[model samples]
Target: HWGYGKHNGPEHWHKDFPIAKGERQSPVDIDTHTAKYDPSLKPLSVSYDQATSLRILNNGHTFNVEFDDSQDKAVLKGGPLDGTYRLIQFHFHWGSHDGQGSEHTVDKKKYAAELHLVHWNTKYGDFGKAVQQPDGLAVLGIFLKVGSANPGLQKVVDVLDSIKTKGKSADFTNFDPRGLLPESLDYWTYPGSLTTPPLLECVTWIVLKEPISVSSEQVSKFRKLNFNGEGEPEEPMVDNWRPTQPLKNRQIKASFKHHHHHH
Candidate 1:
């Protein structure tokens, strides 16, 4: 939602969404040179129940639910994972002053902004209890850039024509968010904490090298999805991002072993 008074902007969102205090945020700078190296990360595969309904929520930000793949199932059944983890809420981080939009910082350099696909381990059974664990969550970090054009984001954009006004939403049915992912599965993995308040320190960070791009104009449009109809006093949605964090002796490693493939 656009930041127009009340609980608008990150400052306000923090007050209303207390979980953000310990939410283990993303899209920090990724400095390759000084990063500590980790070699244990491999391809992570998650399977969903065939009967799941893949619900799509127009909660202001363009988000999709992975169906009846209920949060409970992830914990109780162990899930498409080796262990049980619940699919928690998902959200995005955008640039406040640049064309880049990734949340994770790489090599101390910030990109556009980052989108986080969040999930939690069900070992402790509910979201609250699971989050307390050090390895209780899983997040897929996707970077977004503004430039020539981005076909992947168009699906979310096309609906904008209908929900052009603030606080407006158009239902998206039968769309598989997986389609928005890049073809390459290669990623950078590390053990880190959440980016938001409370900044939980129990996360396995999976950051994709392949960034998804959108047109300069499209990126601008994303900036305008306000919560108070048209232009009010608050800033736009695009500014909902955090600054890069210190690496703090953490190492980032690629899951891909083949050098040529990385090239």
Candidate 2:
């Protein structure tokens, strides 16, 4: 399977998944100087029900909190998106240590970690079908800063020991994802692909400008996770983020006016 390691990392994924080297890959450096302030972008409407959250799974890649996306229990509308995108799952990408784990960077500034809320276009009917077409997905990227401990994430971190190894799952419900967002809804918009293979170039990226707070202790717990299954060789599930790709002929549009301290 494809992973973030010396043998089968992001650099070698193009060998099997050709689209890994596509023009619009994710986790790009967002240069504020070049980003245009688009007045047309609408304020994002995020509606997530804690009751809709189902289970948490350690998929050997990342620990994902799956939601009951069969219905429109949780949906993201407005903001550089054409149609409604229902929330499917939310996960994270981080480094083994602290200071630099976020996938997307702002002016080459990396965060402690990054959170991804995966949503699929409702126009495509279902996530399975939506993932294969252009404009079928929209992902919300929230950067995590090392500061005071975030109570919103405590519920999630408490279960890490239970699902430390791959292929493990735990009952995780009634957790509202909205509480995880920063105060500001301002964001940068672009077109990109999944950071992991099959690296589909179908995502409409909405990266938040403001970062949320997390603690250094909480980040240390994230590195304790293992990528292998129960009996497999243990591999620490850290630095699971893909490196930033070139932004070829792509323009990043910001919903808010560019400011030096806005980030």
How high is the CA lDDT of each candidate model?
A: 0.56, 0.91
Q: Considering summed lDDT, which 10 consecutive residues are worst modelled in model 1? A: 73-82
Instruction: Summarize candidate 2's per-residue lDDT along 178-231 as a digit string, tens digits.
Output: 889998999999999999999999999999999999999998888889999988
Residue 50 error, candidate 2, Å: 5.7
**Tens digit per residue, CA lDDT, model 1, 1-263:** 32423455445545655644443344346665544333555455644332233433433443334434354532222212347555554556665456545667665566665667677776666657766777777777877765667765666666555544445544554544454467676677766767654566767777777877666665665555543455656535555565555555555666554345334
Give the TM-scores of the predictions, in the order they appear.
Answer: 0.70, 0.97
Model 1 residue 211 distance off true place after TM-score fit, in angstroms: 1.7
**lDDT for model 1, on a 0 to 1 scale?**
0.56
